[PDB]
Amino acid sequence: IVNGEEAVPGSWPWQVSLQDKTGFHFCGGSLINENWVVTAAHCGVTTSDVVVAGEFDQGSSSEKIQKLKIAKVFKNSKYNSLTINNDITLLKLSTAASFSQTVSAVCLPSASDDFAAGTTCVTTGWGLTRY
Amino acid sequence: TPDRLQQASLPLLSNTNCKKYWGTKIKDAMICAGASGVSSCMGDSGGPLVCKKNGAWTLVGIVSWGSSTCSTSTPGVYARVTALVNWVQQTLAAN
C-alpha cells in the first residue's frame, strides 16, 4: 500500500500472507473460517505454497505465526484470465487455522448487500509502499 | 516490501464513475476504491478490502489490479465480493 500506515499488530486478524517455498511473500488473503482462505485467482496459488497466519512483521523470528499447508485450490471458474474478471480463489487448508487473539475470520456479505459509493473502507497488506 | 503490515482508509467509488478512469475494463464483478491519495500496490493482490457493517468488518473487495505505477489519483480495482459470494457458499457447501 502506498501512503498507508502501519497497523496495530494483530488488529486485522483475518489477514494472511501467501508464501512460496523459497519464503517469498507474493499475495495476501483473508481467513473466512478456520479452514478456508479467500484470495485472488490471479495469484496463481498451487498446493506447494503456504498460508501464513498471525503475522505482522515479516522480519521476525519470534512471532507465533501459523504456517498452514494448502490442501486444495479452488479457482472460481468464471475466472477470466484475459480480463481478470471474477478474480477469486478459495484455498482449502490441510490443517485448520487455530483461532486466537491474532487469528480470526472476516465476515462475508449477502449477495444482496449494499455498499454505497462514498463509504470509507479499509484495505491492508504487505505490498509495495512506493513504486 | 515493507516488513510490517500496512493499512489504509479509502472510499468506495461507483462503477460508473470508475469507468471514467478505466473504461470497459470495469466489469460487473469488479468494484473500485481509492483515488484518494492512497493506493493498493503490487504485492497487495489477494488481500482484503473491508467495510464495517452493523459493527462487523465485512469482506467487500479482494485486491485485484489497478495502475502500473500505483498512482494515488487513480482508483484501485478489487474483485466485488457480493457478486461472487454465491460461488463461495456453493464451494464451501460442496467441500
Binding site: 488488529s11 486478524p13 483475518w14 491474532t102 479499509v122 | 473491508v50 462487523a56
Partner: peptide
C-alpha cells in the same frame, strides 16, 4: 467474524 480481539486504530 469481523470483530477483532485487538482493535484497529485508524
Amino acid at each position: 467474524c469481523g470483530v477483532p480481539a485487538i482493535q484497529p486504530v485508524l
